[PDB]
């Protein structure tokens, strides 16, 4: 919690990410990607949804808007939850809670959809497995697990630059195939994994173009130093996704 709040997700860090990803988002593709990721998902006003790593709340906002579903977002960063809370009012079907998902308890057979977007990369391998075991219990018999997450080629293939990025971020990045195998080992059914690295590359390019075309505005809100860091960061993701060193994984599975 302290590592994340004092580094990657300081208040300013979150605002910089939001500038490039889009209002209410701090992960890949913002609203447009969310529309696509949820395009084949069916829920209604009676559905219960858990968003693991809910961030600024964009995903809960969209799911509630699209389906009328009850949404409950959990995020470990209290500053981010505070921001999320500031942007939703008068809606008793959107709840945000500051807590570590690894210690959170929910009733078994509780959720119609457990949803997570680029959050589980923060967890160690041991903790990814522990989390998915919890998710299995927490899903309703008829429920669905829906995840996007940063993945990577096998570690043996990483270059110096990518090693440094992963180290600095304290990410644990595994292959798409390894990730799918964890879900299978947790007894999820109908496990579908997709390597969406090409689509991710397209999303990164749109964001990179946006950053460049709105540089003046960015400099006013932030600084040239932060612009350079962001610009170079996206440049590396574009290069590394093109060559499949850094990947974007999509996973969907059911309890039965
Ligand atoms: N153990 C944990 N429990 C809950 N949230 C966690 C967590 N570890 C990291 N996170 C959260 O995961 C989020 C990743 S950023 C993505 C946020 C959101 N899903 C979106 O798409 O915009 C961060 O907000 C971070 O605080």
Pocket test of ligand 1: the residue of 37, 57, 59, 76 to mutate, having most ligand atoms within 8 Å of its CB, is 76
- Chain position carrying tokens 């997709």: 194
Residue of 13, 30, 53 to test ligand 1 pocket, by largest number of atoms within 8 Å of CB = 53
Rg of the chain's alpha carbons, rounded to an integer? 18
Nearest CA to ligand 1 atom 2: 100
Alpha-carbon gap, residue 208 to 238, rounded angstroms: 9
CA distances from 216 to 20, 64, 72, 81, 210 (A): 13, 34, 37, 29, 11
Q: Which of 229, 121, 208 is nearest to 170 (CA)?
A: 121
What is the bridge-based pairing of β-strands 48-52 and 111-117? parallel
Distance between CA 155 and CA 173 in Å, rounded? 8
12 backbone dihedrals φ, ψ, rounded to 5°: -65, -40
> Residue 73's beta-bridge partner residues?
51, 96
Is the Cβ–Cβ distance between 236 and 26 less than 8 Å? no
Terminus-to-terminus CA distance in the chain, angstroms?
34
* CATH fold group of domain 1-256: Rossmann fold (3.40.50)
For 88-105, give the DSSP string: --S-TTEEEEE--TTT--
Sole residue written with tokens 């084949």: 40
* Distance, CA of 32 to CA of 37 (rounded, Å): 9
Phi and psi torsions of 142, nearest 5°: -90, 5
Are 102 and 123 in contact, with CB atoms under 8 Å apart?
yes
Which approach determined this entry? X-ray
Task: Give me ligand 1 centre to Cα 104, in Å.
Answer: 14
Neighbour count for residue 140 (Cβ, 10 Å) = 18
The active-site residue out of 115, 122, 136, 179 is: 122
Distance of alpha carbon 5 from alpha carbon 1, whole angstroms = 6
Contacts within 8 Å (CB) and 24+ apart, 78-85: 78/1, 78/5, 79/5, 79/9, 79/10, 79/11, 79/14, 80/9, 80/14, 80/26, 80/55, 80/56, 81/54, 83/11, 83/14, 83/56, 84/54, 84/55, 84/56, 84/57, 84/60, 85/57
Residue 244, by phi and psi: left (phi above 0), alpha (psi -120 to 50) or beta? left
Where are the chain's structural domains?
1-256
3-state SS of 161-173 is: HHHHHHHHHCCCC
Nearest CA to ligand 1 atom 8: 122
What stretches of the chain show up as alpha helix (H) in DSSP?
A: 2-6, 11-21, 30-37, 58-67, 78-86, 125-138, 160-169, 176-185, 197-213, 215-221, 224-242
DSSP code, position 27:
S
**What residues pair up with 151 in beta bridges, in sequence order?**
247
Q: How far apart are CA 19 and CA 146, in angstroms?
A: 25
Give the integer Cα–Cα distance in Å for 33 and 82.
24
Q: How far is the CA of 130 from the centre of ligand 1 (A)?
A: 17
What DSSP state is assigned to residue 151?
E
- How far apart (Å, rounded) are the C-alpha atoms in residues 241 and 248? 8
* Block residue for tokens 């999820």: 188
Q: Is 119 in the pocket of ligand 1 (CB under 6 A)?
A: yes
| d(CA 52, ligand 1 centre) in Å | 7
Atom of ligand 1 nearest to the CA of 56: 22
Q: Are 52 and 111 contacting, i.e. CB atoms less than 8 angstroms apart? A: no
């Amino acid at each position: 919690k302290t590592f994340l709040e004092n580094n990657q997700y300081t208040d300013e860090g979150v605002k910089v990410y939001e500038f490039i990803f889009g209002e209410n988002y701090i992960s890949s593709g913002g609203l447009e990607a969310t529309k696509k990721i949820l395009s084949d998902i069916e829920l209604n006003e009676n559905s219960k949804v858990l968003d693991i790593g809910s961030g600024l709340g964009g995903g809960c906002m969209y799911i509630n808007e699209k389906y009328g579903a009850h949404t409950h977002g959990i995020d470990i960063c209290s500053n981010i939850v505070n921001m999320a809370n500031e942007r939703v009012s008068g809606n008793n079907k959107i709840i945000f809670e500051a807590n570590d998902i690894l210690t959170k308890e929910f009733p078994e057979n509780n959720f119609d959809l457990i949803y997570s977007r680029d959050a589980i990369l923060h967890l160690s391998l041991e903790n990814k497995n522990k989390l998915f075991q919890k998710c299995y219990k927490w899903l309703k018999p008829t429920g669905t697990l829906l995840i996007t997450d940063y993945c990577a080629t096998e570690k043996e293939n990483w270059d110096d630059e990518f090693k440094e990025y992963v180290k600095q971020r304290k990410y644990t990045l595994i292959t798409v195939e390894e990730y799918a195998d964890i879900l299978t080992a947790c007894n999820f059914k109908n496990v579908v994994s997709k390597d969406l690295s090409d689509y991710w590359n397209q999303l990164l390019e749109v964001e990179h173009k946006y950053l460049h075309e709105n540089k003046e505005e960015f400099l006013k809100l932030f600084s040239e130093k932060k612009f350079i860091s962001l610009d170079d960061g996206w440049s590396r993701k574009i290069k590394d996704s093109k060559r499949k060193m850094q990947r974007w994984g999509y996973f969907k599975a059911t309890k039965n």
